[PDB]
Design a binder for this molecule. Structure first.
Ligand SMILES: NC(=S)Nc1ccc(F)c(Cl)c1
Length: 209
């Protein structure tokens, strides 16, 4: 049972700008997604200080990057706090409503796309390299959910029937045909070292077989 929702007007406007604007420095998408994973890990880590049972769904706090050349997908897995259904449908879109508006004003005052993280809406930079984004997420207080969008102004949410993750968020980037360089091992390593060297959680790059 799949529910279809319309993006908020400002968010849909940002996604169209991110997809249609000529901008060559696309690698920053990884910095933003990794930074988002780091925030989610900070959150579950801080909650576990006063409530250790919040880690019963998984003690390890890490970030995995999983390129897949046959499916042309790049997956970023974190064991962070995860997202509830209300987050996927309401709360995150409400918070991003104002950050998108501010980011758009700045883009006309001289700012460029690489500053998107300063407005809390870095997640949508995924559409620099992806034609479709799938998010599998599990929060301690909710069921496992699957969020998906190919832009166009709508997204879908459904309960995920696949493999249980215990706790965290899986971001699956279905890459555009011309962005397969982000599936190469030495390219991902160069980007992580350049932009995410100081992330305070272990980042593991799965090599393919
Ligand atoms: N940084 C932001 S606004 N992230 C975000 C918003 C809505 C979503 F459904 C997902 Cl998966 C992520």
């Amino acid at each position: 049972e799949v529910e279809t929702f319309a993006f908020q007007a400002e968010i849909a406007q940002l996604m169209s700008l991110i997809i249609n604007t000529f901008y060559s420095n696309k690698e920053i998408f990884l910095r933003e997604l990794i930074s988002n994973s780091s925030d989610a890990l900070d959150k579950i880590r801080y909650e576990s200080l006063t409530d250790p049972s919040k880690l019963d769904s998984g003690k390890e706090l890490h970030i995995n990057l999983i390129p897949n050349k046959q499916d042309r997908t790049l997956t970023i897995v974190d064991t962070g706090i995860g997202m509830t259904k209300a987050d996927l449908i309401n709360n995150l879109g409400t918070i991003a409503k104002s950050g998108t508006k501010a980011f758009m004003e700045a883009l006309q005052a001289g700012a460029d796309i690489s500053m998107i993280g300063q407005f809390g809406v870095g997640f949508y930079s995924a559409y620099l390299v992806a034609e479709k984004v799938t998010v599998i997420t599990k929060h301690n207080d909710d069921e496992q959910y699957a969020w998906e969008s190919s832009a166009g102004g709508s997204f879908t949410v459904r309960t995920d029937t696949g493999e249980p993750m215990g706790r965290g968020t899986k971001v699956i980037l279905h890459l555009k045909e011309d962005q397969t360089e982000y599936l190469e091992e030495r390219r991902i390593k160069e980007i992580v070292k350049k932009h995410s060297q100081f992330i305070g959680y272990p980042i593991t790059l799965f090599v393919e077989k």
